[PDB]
Write a protein that binds this ligand. Structure first.
Ligand SMILES: Nc1ncnc2c1ncn2[C@@H]1O[C@H](COP(=O)(O)OP(=O)(O)O)[C@@H](O)[C@H]1O
Ligand SMILES: Nc1ncnc2c1ncn2[C@@H]1O[C@H](COP(=O)(O)OP(=O)(O)O)[C@@H](O)[C@H]1O
Lengths: 97, 37, 370, 370
């Protein structure tokens, strides 16, 4: 039972995203106004995405021993990896990320 | 971006157009027959 | 039992596929395989080596496009496996090759090894429940709805005529020459060189095909037009240049009616039709002359049908009604015919089951080849 | 052993270096070795016989400047070693030459000996754990976001054009002329001599560079200002003198667009780029004309973008859209790209270990050149 990782998002981004959601409008970079230019905000974002890369590497570099262990563990292993990576890519492809 | 970073180094040219660009601008028929009598 | 038959129309130049019962083939793309030529340097580049379909067409400059099938004969089976595997990918079908019987179009007079190894490929790597190899002319006549008549096709690598009588495709009257669309493009490339414009890159031969598809026509009089200077229309390359063609636009598809230009003792298309009709029962000649169906992409040139009528009139006996039909789905004739054929209840008894293939082998396919 | 790789932009005009991951190069000192000219008499004077960077920029008059690297090719290895030692010194990095991987850039088409000796220095004098030599084109694409483009850089010594498409570099289309900022400064010196102001010392050569950077522009037309014989804008010297120039603040930078003025048949910078695009594949022209990246300090002249656009527009086929992306970090683009590349983990696979070089040698570097 391979763990799952919920990738965090900057809450301010979600605030403006929900504000774009209260009305019928797609979220975009232009909506932050003069907030994109904040080196503090972008530095926070850089740190967050760096943590995301760390978290995903924790799952993508995973592998088990094909020699030992039961065969069922290997079959279930590859299936669980597909589930993990499938949910990971859906988290990645979200409009917030 | 990093505006103070550009304030640090001396070569970054400000107030110059960053992108130079060129101007923009705005099956056959069937039954080909031929009788013969 | 399976889900639904998948009609995969092959072709040396353009493969066409979709499920049976469909109206038009939803999935059509060129039958080539492009792998990059340059060097991967920057990271984040186009991952993966072999490209097929729209992605291979898009980034055409990087690839070194080759064809795995030529003259209806597969030369490389690995590229064909990747092409068929691409047909079953998420970009085209999104299905599995284990729940679908397969209708497979195939050109006449081909070697036995094509059917044999192609069957091995399907029933072994794909493990399809049922495979059925068939002709192409039979399917085109089924697509038009009528039943007795000859079929004149010229795809990308082959061209042949089959006199079909109520479905029984007469196997003793199938004339077949190997001068089709791709070869016409090749000869056009030679004439473009003689014009002065050089195109020799593998990913530039495709530009020569584009020129053949939108700048060539067929002269009614083959010689009277050669003794004149045409208007020499231009052509815009993808690069943005300009090519004035001149006489290299009507003499290029002239090859189909005279393969002396390529230096070959074969015959023209008109002679393939007349010999296919005359090598049949004398009691059916009038019926065959009154029913000619064209198919295949090479029958799309301007002035093709009209010149074919003139040529056949010169070869047919006097006062015999000649009639050449030309439907609007010559590119999709064999596929639509496959959609009509495989969607019938008799197709269950017409295929070859996987069990049968495992029992007898390739001999079972040659046994039930029709 | 590795912690934050050291990116080094080994440029013949100014060496830019810092650690990996740094958004901005922290140390950008000029690439020259300053030795004194006047004897030391008074005790307690300046120490040492080698002045590099900030010290050899304040006491410029006391020094004689010897550029180590010329046209992207090292002449005195001793001087380059000293400059690299200055990079790892206390006033610059306080690190050891054994604890960090080193990314050292290089111009394309340099001789093999530069790669060999550069690695010999970094593996013998410096016991660097990891060394990777790159191209000074890919890095600008990294630091500009794009992956498809024509990198047209003009450093102080060598300009070139590298067409990279979707991460794939087309090495045979690389054009490279050895005429850049040095030649512009030197030719500006000859224009001042024709205007009556001589400069012969090496320390006063940087004053010529100062004139170039502070007063030279590029006219949109070569003859609309030529025979006009414009005003003579004054310019102050570091002492308090006065230099009026006139027909040299635009006549000196036209050496890049036409090196016939220097007496060398070659191609201008515009012909470098246009020939690098035209040598590439037929399908890849529009994407390369719409993706032109600028780099190098010589691409900072006033009116440089307009001149480059008009020259390419004259040489490109009609109506082709030409976009020239010109970022504000043209001096540090290659370095920032180096800080990006060394901050990745694929770089770990891309470098060369010390034992790799010990068991193989130069061969290992030519193997991982791309
Ligand atoms: N408008 C056109 N004019 C002339 N030739 C064409 C045209 N369109 C396509 N072709 C040629 O016809 C060929 C298509 O035939 P194809 O569908 O490949 O037959 P098959 O699929 O049986 O091989 C293509 O190779 C192309 O070169
Ligand atoms: N603001 C400027 N305007 C014009 N030219 C400049 C400017 N700043 C620097 N240069 C010229 O460009 C060179 C910058 O060197 P660079 O292009 O970085 O060479 P390299 O790429 O080899 O390091 C300087 O030596 C000088 O010749």
């Amino acid at each position: 039972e391979i763990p799952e990782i919920s990738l965090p998002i900057h809450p301010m981004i979600t605030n403006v995203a929900k504000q774009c959601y209260e009305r019928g409008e797609k979220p975009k970079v232009t909506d932050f106004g003069d907030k994109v230019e904040d080196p503090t905000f972008l530095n926070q974002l850089q740190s967050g995405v760096n943590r995301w890369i760390r978290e995903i590497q924790k799952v993508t570099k995973l592998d088990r021993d094909p020699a030992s262990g039961t065969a069922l563990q290997e079959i279930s292993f590859w299936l669980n990896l597909e589930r993990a990576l499938y949910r990971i890519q859906e988290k990645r492809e979200s409009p917030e990320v | 971006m990093a505006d103070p970073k550009y304030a640090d180094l001396p070569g970054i040219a400000r107030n110059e157009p960053d992108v130079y660009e060129t101007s923009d601008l705005p099956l056959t028929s069937t039954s080909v027959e031929h009788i013969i009598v | 039992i399976a889900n639904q038959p998948v009609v995969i129309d092959n072709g040396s130049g353009v493969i066409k596929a979709g499920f049976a019962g469909d109206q038009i083939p939803k999935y059509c793309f060129p039958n080539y395989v492009g792998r990059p030529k340059h060097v991967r340097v920057m990271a984040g580049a186009l991952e993966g080596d072999i490209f097929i379909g729209p992605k291979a067409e898009e980034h055409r400059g990087l690839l070194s496009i080759r064809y795995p099938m030529e003259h209806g004969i597969v030369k490389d089976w690995n590229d064909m496996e990747r092409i068929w595997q691409y047909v079953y990918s998420k970009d085209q079908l999104q299905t599995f090759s284990e729940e679908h019987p397969v209708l497979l179009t195939e050109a006449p007079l081909n070697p036995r090894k094509n059917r044999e190894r192609a069957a091995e490929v399907f029933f072994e790597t794909f493990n399809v429940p049922a495979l059925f190899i068939s002709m192409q002319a039979v399917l085109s006549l089924y697509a038009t709805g009528r039943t007795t008549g000859v079929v004149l096709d010229s795809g990308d690598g082959v061209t042949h005529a089959v006199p079909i009588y109520e479905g029984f495709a007469m196997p003793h009257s199938i004339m077949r020459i190997d001068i089709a669309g791709r070869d016409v493009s090749r000869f056009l490339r030679l004439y473009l060189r003689k014009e002065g414009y050089d195109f020799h890159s593998s990913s530039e031969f495709e530009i020569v095909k584009a020129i053949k598809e939108r700048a060539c026509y067929l002269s009614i009089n083959p010689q009277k037009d050669e003794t004149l200077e045409t208007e020499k229309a231009q052509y815009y390359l993808p690069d943005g240049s300009t090519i004035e063609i001149g006489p290299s636009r009507f003499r290029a598809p002239e090859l189909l009616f005279r393969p002396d230009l390529i230096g070959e003792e074969s015959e023209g298309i008109h002679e393939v039709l007349v010999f296919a009709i005359q090598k049949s029962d004398m009691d059916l000649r009038r019926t065959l002359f009154s029913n000619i169906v064209l198919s295949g992409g090479s029958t799309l040139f301007k002035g093709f049908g009209d010149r074919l009528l003139s040529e056949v009139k010169k070869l047919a006996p006097k006062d015999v009604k000649i009639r050449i039909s030309a439907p609007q789905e010559r590119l999709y004739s064999t596929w639509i015919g496959g959609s009509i054929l495989a969607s019938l209840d008799t197709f269950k008894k017409m295929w070859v089951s996987k069990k049968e293939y495992e029992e007898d082998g390739a001999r079972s396919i040659h046994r039930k080849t029709f």
